[model samples]
Target chain A: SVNALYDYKFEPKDKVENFHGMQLLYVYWPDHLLFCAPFALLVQPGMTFSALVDEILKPATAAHPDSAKADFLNAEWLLNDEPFTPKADASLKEQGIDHKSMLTVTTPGLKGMANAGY
Target chain B: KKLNLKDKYQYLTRDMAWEPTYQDKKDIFPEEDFEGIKITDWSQWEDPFRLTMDAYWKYQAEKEKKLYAIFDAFAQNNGHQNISDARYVNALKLFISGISPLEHAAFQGYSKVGRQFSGAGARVACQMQAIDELRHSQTQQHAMSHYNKHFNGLHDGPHMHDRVWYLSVPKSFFDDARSAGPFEFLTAISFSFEYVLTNLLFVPFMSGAAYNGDMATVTFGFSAQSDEARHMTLGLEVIKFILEQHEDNVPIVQRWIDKWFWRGFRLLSLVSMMMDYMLPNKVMSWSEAWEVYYEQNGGALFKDLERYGIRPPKYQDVANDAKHHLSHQLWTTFYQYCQATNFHTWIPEKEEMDWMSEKYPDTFDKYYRPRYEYLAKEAAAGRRFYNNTLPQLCQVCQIPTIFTEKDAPTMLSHRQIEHEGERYHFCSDGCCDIFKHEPEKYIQAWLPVHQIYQGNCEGGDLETVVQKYYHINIGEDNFDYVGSPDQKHWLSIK
Candidate 1:
């Protein structure tokens, strides 16, 4: 459930094993003058289904907590303007979160985004 | 306990007092050699924090005792464990390395202001604030040492603060603040940083800690934030104190307000990114945060200040317009080079992308999101992109040339000029104005970008640059989070 207003869409999925961290956590790519920092640069993390955001970036998951359901790992995701995809459970680790990719994570059909120059 | 607290403060605080009837009295006060803002009535100054020595000692000690308890528990319990994600830890690394020293700088600055000022009320406030600043610096380090025991980049923070290119932005900000005349120093830091933008500065990050389960950070952050309302009060009181001194002092204070506001604002650009991007469990979009903090509160303060002939900061409109893109650019620069620093980087989740679109409807989708997604696409194709541009920095603020022009938002808000037979580039005319007015200060600027070119930093490899210079390890603290030890810790629990 994304908008069509965005100018472009990149089909994401390129496995890179070196990228390590939470298979459950997700973010869209985005930056810079000097560049930004650590979430520990913040506090630690935990929460409600939509209970978290870096503070400035409120997640849509905050609003749409129940609409899209799958195993916590297989949740497939879509960009703001991309067409919806029928998808299943996949942890962000199962997704092998990479440099340029958007896919389901943590649950089947759980959509996610992962990158470095993100 | 027999005496009233107020009475005790009135007696004990003034107990050490004496007028200097010796050595021309002028030598004792030395009010002439400085930028002569004649304060004939130094007695009229005020101490807003309201701390008597005993109260200051007992209150701060108790607060620290409370925080130290949590710090121990958080560490003993492996509290670095549950974040929104492991990638989030990188933000803390940057905060430790980047932000902690500014507290140290503030301590140094305020310590001098406390001593140099002639007003008893002002001097007492400044002295207390100086102690407060030092306390923050020490506490931040002490708080972070727990993480350093378990994490990478968190070590060598002070060194990185001194040497990193981007860090010089904050370094220069306070250095410039401290280097000014005593009254001007207070106006720049106390007014602009503490009062005007303190909301945006401290609250979001503290709350960010609360949301992310970093209770140690949250507790200490509150410990610090508790001191800030007092700091803000001091900021307000100092500005008013100077203005009321003489009608002629109004213009001088107003100009310092302008100069320091823009300077202080540039410093916040990094904080904007921290709020917007660095935290995994984001609180709000930068646009909304600005609306709630600086935009709303700042306007109210300005309306109240209008009677003082203070219109507002010089580039309020410019700052207002640049909020969205400033975060965008700030994150980009760091995201590009998170490899060199501590922590990691990543794209937002799909939900986050949608949220930013809605929140930043005026600009996010149109100008910013596509760049992120496209960069992700490039990386997916095995083409990792890096900003090759050796950033041109502003002289007064010393941040990179990422902010755009007021009239045109797409292009970088960039300017360059030659002063005294040397070429210099700046992020804006506002900065150039700062340089033109104080060419001596600007010319002697310790801009990290320029220093790099001048071979002041170790070159040749990323390891040397990050370690010998920045004082952080490469694989441990400086790399993409993918497959790092931070992830290993999380996976074991999940």
Candidate 2:
């Protein structure tokens, strides 16, 4: 007799090669500059390239009235269109770049991991 | 002259059935001796359809010819004009792919029992149903194949039927029967599912097809369901025969009734979702169908059977609680996940939703509308909402985790039973009660939740699982409205 659980197994034999999964990011700010600077700190000189941007930072940047101007600068710095050219010894601590705690996020898959912070 | 000849043959066929002489009836139907169900007389049982071999063959052949002609015409005309929209045709395609093969399975199963039934009359009835089921499978395939040739996900439906997430609801129910002892199988599929719930599924589809102007489908559905009336009679007769043949058969048959009723009710989730959500031009919501089919018909039938000491299904009350809200809830889930579905589903228009609300005044606006509104907002934002991926499948019914408790209304029903050191959990007392009575019979249930945990599904997650099980392609281009063969054809016509 077949019990109900007899058919719920999820083993997959086939694998898709070179497939990269996607991920979405939502970030908070004043923290944006600290988060942005950490991407350069986390990436070693030889690390592969990936995209990064602040997608939801505006709402967070405006959430605090006392730090509104400071947070806005952080959002502006992250949104700058300048190409990311990382140099050796480019570490946030070494560069004295301190704004708030760093939020270095990594998603699943190569593209997600490459496009880590927003 | 031909009409007279046919009538004579039909009379002769009816007259051919005779009382058994070679052996005592006890030796023929032993199971009836063990169960403590009482009936004073076997001959009290009646076959309401009053079918005989000659009339059966004649009408069956006529129905087949009519159906085949429609099939040929639809195929010849390319099937484009028969439906309200490609979205609607997708529903038919899913039905053909997911359900048609099971008809063949039932045909094969019943044909075996047809040979073993003690009475020639009962045997002949089973034989006719076997033929009916085979024809149903073939006719459905011929009708739905028109879209299969033009669609991407039509192939491998039978394979998916046994393994897909939602399809398990039907597949496992049948599988539960196919694995049972012969008598239990008969009681389960032939009596409970066919007699009690068959009309609930077929009538709506036939009438809905008629309402939507799909003449071919309407014809096919009605023709098949007309046979169902006879089949239902066969079930009633079979149960009555067992009850009256021996003093002991009542409780056993009652237990089977309790078991099969829940099994069949769980399988109708597909019908529920389809009626409540799939039809482009809604005729009735699933809740309404259940109220008419279950509350009225089922209530009357069970009330009559109470004289035999058989209670309604163990889950009858659970079904009652859900009748008002289950369909709308499931449809809400279906519409949200259609982006990953092989069958296309859409939100009902304001007028249709209002009609639904009016039809299901007790639960529609209260339980179903807010979910649709949330999903519509997500759709407008170009984001498809996917509900939480995992659902617990019943160990006996194999349906997703969404049923409420038995007798206790307003609380979800989840219970477990252990047999010979093994544990089994069910969605309700009806299912659990059935499982405890005959664990061996339900052990064969193909629960989809256990299958996923065992890692036998296509992908480890939702999208891969949908692709492997339901044949959906999850991507932007797949969902695009333009450039689709169905959409392009619709545009050309309008």
Candidate 3:
């Protein structure tokens, strides 16, 4: 089921936690090849790989457009590829930075409207 | 040594802006998200006027000096004789009260936005404009107040500006911009009103003043218009920078263009009526004015921007559709006001009506003539014709409910949006969207319709409202052209 926790897991960890830790990886498989890949790939270290594989192959939880699998994987790939690191603190301080001052920032809030060029 | 001192001062005052060293350009000036605009670079913006602090202060002081000299002359010579008539002077009074404070409001807006702007050139330009707006308010009042002291209609202009029926048009337009965020304010006023629509306002008004023998007003208007030309250059530069910087910026700028254009256009109802109906010795009809101002200038200007993927405003088509019909609409409005106005309203002689017919060939006869005839018949029956006294006002444009539906031109369009259990109506979808983004600012708006409904006017009746609001008593015999103090006095001089 899609939930805030699953969405958080997909978010760049640095963006969410403000510190970096484990690396996230995303793998894409074509629809026809979905059955070929071992479901164990979905499992994390704390969970057994066999159980993960079994959970993924289960028809009730099979990946589909309605499922969060694709979006979560895409978000994971984006986070891993562009690992976030806090910008240099001293460099920011030298420029007379006010860490607490909140300047309004806008990001894409509308669906189908968030594209890089804009 | 003297030249060096001047140069040193100039550098200290104007050359202070520099490239951002600490943050990415986007971090300091974040891009807006709702409009789907793109910009690859913000550095392309340029200020063509090349204003420096030395030039700004020097010119500003000169402008103030010139204005003070005119005020002194008018006070000494008793220049109220130069005005057209009591009724005509009422129009000028309305202009002062309703339009002058807007200059100050605009300055306040620019002062805030000047800090947020990315380009040093734009920042300096806005700062200069902030000063200019204060000067405009001061000078306009100094000149127009002469009429207030000597004439009938010129008193209590500020209060009238807020509550008067027709005066609400300009009030609402400025309130719309004031209610917006810094970026949108720039788009609405600096770009749309001052740049695109200023010629229709400043040029004709100054020319009319010159023709009407109001030298002081003409001089002030002409001097301000010179400043306005520079302001237009800045607006053009800003829009060009946005469009050229990123492909995504096209849709964003286009939406602003669309939204502000309608808002500005709706406010010009007074100008439309003034040009066609108010000026006794008419210089140009409103239809001709729109053709030259909107069709030629606006059309060519938008076409120029098309190279950068920017389309004309979303309402451009609707504006074009209304161009021929605008004069008729304005005449209807003024005709209603004339019955109770301090200004005299006469049925345009057949010659003037024929001229209107010739100018507005497409819509004049088909749409207006029949309606005018019906009104004339009503007036003949001793019942001066008037429209529904209370018309719906657009929450964004604040114009009396008058625009037709989007894309479907046959029917009038009214849009309602609910916020905090209160309903706000807009003339179009664009205005509603603008209002939705900043409801708090708009909620404080002095809506004329609401004021009247609240019984906060000078008097409940129209004549009392005119006198109390405008400070000119139309019912007094002093307004009679034959035996009036000014007319008799002028005849004695001849």
Candidate 4:
């Protein structure tokens, strides 16, 4: 509990409207330590999972050599720690991915360069 | 009558307090109790250092005269050229941009807290520390000002500190402390930072400077060294005074210590990277520094504080476990995001990796060495890497979620919580607990990533955000040090 002297009512900075209707999506490509932290991307809730992979995830992961051969669609996925099945045509909002939701994508047998999780 | 230092301090500090004439004491010092601390006697507050105002001014003025004289000589002699390498100046650039501005923030914090205390001794101590912070900020700037003439990234320190993405880790730390109530402020900064963790920052950085040929920074470090001792003593006094005032104060003070220690440890992740990776000439490994400064010194200090029913900070065990991997993980994060930073990053040289193998015998070769080796191979093929997207920043610490599990080195140790129907992420459990305890403060965190997404950062793309919003001069201030202007300039000069 905060020891505030007065009522401290303030809006959170990540309110959906603050992103101009786009939501903040974080993607963690496991075994890719070379990419550092999970990527924070702005995406429309109406965009399909396929569109997100093809447009956003593909380019973001391109620098990694695994990006060329790894299958993101077939990759194991977790949405906010729950096992997730990504529908290619389903919108992110329809898939229950809200603002600031985390998507952990782990590509099997595609450990990063040098097999050191890089 | 002539008086000794103790008597003079009492006369100048303690003797100045008076019973309120008209206003209620509570009204006069309103913020003293809101933090749940029960200070029963203001007189129990100890004057940690006993320099009277007159002596303080005289001593400080003399130091200033000597300090500026050395700064002048160093600049005249082109002292920036004398450093171990241009890469060494990057450490100074990190210091000026990341650490020095924090000194100025400390000034603001102490100035405010100095007014809030009812006890004159406490107030005087804070006031002196406030001036010390201000002077440290100025002296640090003067010490590095010549580097600005020679280096690409040293041109703007305070400006970049305010807006840069990675710098928010340090900036938000001071902001958190300053925004808290006075006692909490002191507990967070004075006790946790100045007392517990200061040596890790000061000793290595100063020693690193002397080892390298940065005389100006070395002089500033010497000038500030005594003041740091006084601040640490005052920090002890502040903690002890609160603990001894009432039995009820123990748990509250413990909670603050736990919170602040974890916060400080997270903030020092940058320093960890600097110690291991940024220094062109190594002083000591971050792991070694942590063991000496924190594990050893802090262990004995807490054992003494056990009489007051205070335990070591929560999650100190996790911190102890992380010493092996902290710098390696942090350096890799910065390596990928160098395009957005004010300073450069590179794969450590073969000797440096060998040093890590010697220093971090158990973990370095197993995990971090291969990562750097792969990065080197990639760079050799002209694929000098930069992470293509912005990184996920923790809601509390504002650092990227790059830290891995203490037990599992390869697994990222990020935690996410749903509060008020919105998801907030943290770099670790420490930051998560800080947020869970005070969601109100952290929810309002102006996370640089979120700010950019919200269009508040004044740019449409990442490069635009870095260049225009952060004021980082692309192709000059940011990227690999190997072929950069700073390296080229150093080679030309040498």
Top model by lDDT, which number?
4
2 or 3, greater by DockQ = 2
When only chain A is evaluated, what TM-score does every model earn?
A: 0.21, 0.21, 0.21, 0.97
Residue-level lDDT tens digits of model 3 in B392-452 = 4666666655555544322345565556544456666767776775565565566554554
**What is the per-residue lDDT of model 1 for residues B170-192, given as tens digits with 9 covering 90 to 100?**
88887877767777788888988
Candidate 2 lDDT over residue span B1-494, tens digit each? 44464354435544566566997776765433322444465334444455555767788788788778877887788655657765566556557655677798889888877765555455666787888899888777776676677655566678667666667667767776775556677788778888888777786677878777677677788777677777788878777677666656776777678777777777777777776666778777777788888889988988888877778777576687777766765665455345555565566778878887887786567545655565566568775454333444566676544554443322335455445534455666777776666666565455554444445566666667766555666542134333455567667766
Q: Which parts of model 1 have CA positions greater than 4 angstroms off?
A: A1-118, B1-16, B31-33, B460-463, B483-485
Model-by-model DockQ, in order: 0.03, 0.03, 0.01, 0.80
- Candidates' RMSD to native: 16.5, 13.1, 21.7, 1.4
Question: Least lDDT summed over 10 consecutive residues: which range in candidate 3 chain B?
Answer: B477-486
* Stretches of model 2 off by over 4 angstroms after superposition: A1-118, B1-55, B151-153, B336-340, B404-412, B416-424, B440-444, B468-493
Best by DockQ: 4
Model no. 4, DockQ: 0.80
lDDT of 4 at B224: 88
- Which of the CAPRI classes, incorrect, acceptable, medium or high, describes model 4? medium
Query: Mind giving the per-residue lDDT tens digits that candidate 3 earns over A18-79?
Result: 21221111122222111111111111223332232244322322322223332321221111
**Per-model TM-score on C-alpha atoms:** 0.78, 0.71, 0.67, 0.98
